[PDB]
């Protein structure tokens, strides 16, 4: 088969600035009709892949005119001049010249934005989870930007391990930032043999940790 | 304006098989290729073969020559892939796109799992004085313990989406699923406004509409 390469995973880029994105291919894509058979398509979160170029140097129709491809027969990049906040996505690149056709492994579109330390929120369980003999204990980091951020849990100050999931959202089309969440998972018997429950935060735009707390009771 | 829709999720059975359907709309269906790609959960994209509906000629991946057989109804004008043999290598987004990859389906998710469906509870995440700052207040929903994917939620029906964050589930040590969704409101607001996170989790027919009150 052609195998398709794309040595980054991602790339930074700050809006208005431009990007080139690289792909190369194990084997010319030029066909004797003249073409070159690459495609460059870009998938949004959550979204079905978009056609980007199309024979390797040819705007695909609607796709703005800051989007450009070039390349030889086996290196390629897709340039995107002036890019907006919106263009956060995966760029693959893919070949149409021989079956089987193949993708590269796709290149993420970082959008470099001001750091930006997170807002902190903690949710106690609800009373109704609580009746169902379980407590979920939720710490909300919000709108930070780099995408790093450890969260640490801390029951009666003492360090948690091993009880907690973090779920991290892709990068915001508007404002670029990402959000997180903690959720420590405790027994309701567990969970009321305590009465101080903290999330500590770590963050490049934070000089020091920052720690949220409840105590049980209100 | 062209479509291309696909059939809905399916949750199916280790070792059965499954038929997903792309069904074509505002074009000439046996005029065109439709080709089928495959997409496993965070991972890059795969092809599995493409159909002539004119000709019913097919070429396949040879990696997916014993799991797919492409097929084309030109009557409905319709195009099916049947994968055979299915074990949880096969748990993935299909989708269907017309030949070159302009105009594409929306994805079928296909679930392969012996684990029974369970709907989840939902739980509100009540806004405090812990998640209020600056005038902002943070609340949310928990939807804990469902199995299979995906469950989709929304604010209001659907009037309230700036300040929503609806985070990626996560799969529990216990193998169900749980996800929360959660939004900034102005905390002016949390004595005149109700909010309400609208919970579908459609393999358990579950919905709920979830009131989050203050506390
Ligand atoms: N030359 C290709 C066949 C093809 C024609 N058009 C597109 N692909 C092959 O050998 O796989």
Known sequence: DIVMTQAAPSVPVTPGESVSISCRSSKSLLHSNGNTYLFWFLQRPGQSPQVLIYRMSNLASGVPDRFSGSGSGTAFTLRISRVEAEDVGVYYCMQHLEYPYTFGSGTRLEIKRTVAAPSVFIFPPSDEQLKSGTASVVCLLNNFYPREAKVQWKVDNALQSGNSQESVTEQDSKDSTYSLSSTLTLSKADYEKHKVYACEVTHQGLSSPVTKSFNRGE | ?215
Not at chain 2, 90 to 104: H, K, Q
Not at chain 2, 121 to 133: E, G, N, Q, W
């Open chain 2, 1 to 215: 304006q062209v479509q291309l829709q696909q059939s809905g999720a399916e949750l199916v059975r280790p070792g059965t098989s499954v038929k997903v359907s792309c069904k074509a709309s505002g074009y000439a269906f046996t005029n065109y290729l439709i080709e089928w790609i495959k997409q496993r959960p965070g991972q890059g994209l795969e092809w599995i073969g493409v159909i002539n509906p004119g000709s019913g000629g097919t070429n396949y991946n040879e990696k997916f020559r014993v799991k797919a057989t492409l097929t084309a109804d030109k009557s409905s004008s319709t195009a099916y892939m049947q994968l055979s043999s299915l074990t949880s290598d096969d748990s993935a987004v299909y989708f269907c796109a017309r030949g070159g990859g302009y105009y594409w389906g929306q994805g079928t998710l296909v679930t392969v799992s012996a684990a029974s469906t369970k709907g989840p509870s939902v739980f509100p995440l009540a806004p405090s004085s812990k998640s209020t700052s600056g005038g902002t207040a943070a609340l949310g929903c928990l939807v804990k313990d469902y199995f299979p994917e995906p469950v989709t939620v929304s604010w209001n029906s659907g009037a309230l989406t700036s300040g929503v964050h609806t985070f990626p589930a996560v799969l529990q040590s216990s193998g169900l699923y749980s996800l929360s969704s959660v939004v900034t409101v102005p905390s002016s607001s949390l004595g005149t406004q109700t909010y309400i996170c609208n919970v579908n989790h459609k393999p358990s027919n579950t919905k709920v509409d979830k009131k989050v009150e203050p506390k």
